[PDB]
Amino acid sequence: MRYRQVHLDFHTSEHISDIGRNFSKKNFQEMLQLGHVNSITVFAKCHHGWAYFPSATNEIHPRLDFDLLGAQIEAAHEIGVKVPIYISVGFDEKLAWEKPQWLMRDEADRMNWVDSFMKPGYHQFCLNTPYLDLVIEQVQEVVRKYDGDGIFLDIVGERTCYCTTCLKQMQADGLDPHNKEDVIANGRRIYANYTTRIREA
């Protein structure tokens, strides 16, 4: 495990243009060397939900014209820098707008982290929904196609969720959604099911 890592965030709005236009192998390598960096986690998929590579299971950032993920792995590997790859799991904001039925709900029907679409911020998906199948596909694509040094999966953990899918499933399994213990235990199974499916894929 390398001692000198950078976690390179790239949560980038669809409403910003010319993504990566000022990227260069030379600039990326010079700054890693200036920083004495020997590992840099770079983005395949951000909170806004875009891919930074020409993806078949997800949509590339609509203002990105080239394989930024590919260019970063190559530039770093050519100077002996490892490159783990980041995938946002809990957040996919451009999918949130198409599939709000897959978002987490509390007892009072509230989304997190932000409780409406009329305010800025991100809306967390429930991994007890078919969103899990889309995550596995997208993780599989990145692991097949890119020579990364690992996967960092973000916005995950044991939750308590009262979404339509969870409430139906709890009732069918004889659990009581009004019993907090039952919902906490459901969420322990939901999270373990997600990490088991990731390790097997």
Give the residues lining the site for Zn ion (CB under 5 A): 126, 128, 161, 163, 166
Minimum separation from the CB atom of position 172 to a second copy (A): 12
166 has binding-site annotation: yes
Residue 171 as a binder of a second copy (CB under 8 A): the answer is: no
Which secondary-structure segment (H or E) carries 43? strand 39-45
Binding flags for a second copy, 48-87, as an x/- string (CB under 8 A): ----------------------------------------
46 has binding-site annotation: no
163 has binding-site annotation: yes
Residue 121 as a binder of a second copy (CB under 8 A): the answer is: no
Neighbour-count burial of 199, counting CB atoms closer than 10 A to its CB (0-12 exposed, 13-18 middle, 19+ buried): exposed
126 has binding-site annotation: yes
Distance CA 170, CA 144 (A): 35
Distance CA 45, CA 56 (A): 13
Distance CA 51, CA 201 (A): 19
Minimum separation from the CB atom of position 78 to a second copy (A): 43
Minimum separation from the CB atom of position 123 to Zn ion (A): 13
181: which strand partners?
none
Find all residues with CB under 8 Å of 119, minimum gap 6, and list them. Answer: none
Residue positions forming the annotated binding site: 126, 161, 163, 166
